[PDB]
Amino acid sequence: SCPKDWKPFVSHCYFILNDSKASWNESEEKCSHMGAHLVVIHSQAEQDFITSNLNTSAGYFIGLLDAGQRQWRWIDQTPYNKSATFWHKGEPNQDWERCVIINHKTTGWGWNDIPCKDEHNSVCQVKK
Ligand SMILES: CO[C@H]1O[C@H](CO[C@H]2O[C@H](CO)[C@@H](O)[C@H](O)[C@@H]2O[C@@H]2O[C@H](CO)[C@@H](O)[C@H](O)[C@H]2NC(C)=O)[C@@H](O[C@@H]2O[C@H](CO)[C@@H](O)[C@H](O)[C@H]2NC(C)=O)[C@H](O[C@H]2O[C@H](CO)[C@@H](O)[C@H](O)[C@@H]2O[C@@H]2O[C@H](CO)[C@@H](O)[C@H](O)[C@H]2NC(C)=O)[C@@H]1O
Numbered sequence: 001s002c003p004k005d006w007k008p009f010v011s012h013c014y015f016i017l018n019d020s021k022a023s024w025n026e027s028e029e030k031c032s033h034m035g036a037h038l039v040v041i042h043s044q045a046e047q048d049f050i051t052s053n054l055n056t057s058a059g060y061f062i063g064l065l066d067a068g069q070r071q072w073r074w075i076d077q078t079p080y081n082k083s084a085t086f087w088h089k090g091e092p093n094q095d096w097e098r099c100v101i102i103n104h105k106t107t108g109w110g111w112n113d114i115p116c117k118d119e120h121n122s123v124c125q126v127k128k
């Protein structure tokens with residue numbers, strides 16, 4: 001019950017934007033054109049579902065932003081739950097890196113703060 005090329009997970013459909021790279025704002029615009037938004041992750045189940053679908057050579061924007069002074073906020077305004085975050089060791093690390101990607105390292109998948117202007121792949125999400 002998800003559209004062609006989207007992957008279902010419980011109440012949502014997920015799209016892995018692999019065909020091109022874009023800035024955070026451009027990525028959110030692409031998701032928006034499909035009636036979706038950059039992914040908002042509320043559990044390890046969701047995190048692990050998403051990473052199972054990703055290329056280890058690529059980085060993927062998610063819908064998490066530093067609103068100021070390391071105040072992480074989801075783009076759909078749902079609460080940032082400190083009990084379900086997946087930062088890489090040593091991340092987040094830099095004030096001018098206000099956007100977040102999922103990327104892969106020797107220690108596995110995780111989140112890293114990066115500059116919003118840096119072009120990456122992304123994951124879109126929409127309710128079924
Ligand atoms: C060694 O890692 C640290 O430095 C990286 C920058 O390295 C350049 O600058 C240093 C001097 O400061 C120099 O010693 C290096 O040789 C290198 O020089 C540059 O080389 C390139 C050719 O590759 C050349 O074109 C440049 O002219 C030349 N510049 C200079 C000044 O000599 C840094 O990596 C950078 O990260 C930023 C985002 O902050 C990104 O825009 C840059 O593209 C990227 N540059 C390179 C070369 O990779 C490292 O920062 C990483 O890793 C940190 C953890 O150690 C993370 O916290 C950071 O968030 C950042 O993560 C990366 O973010 C990009 C986002 O675009 C993402 O694609 C990657 O997957 C991700 N990597 C990881 C490991 O998460 C770090 O400070």
Ligand SMILES: [Ca+2]
Nearest residue numbers: 093112113114
């Ligand atoms: Ca970082």
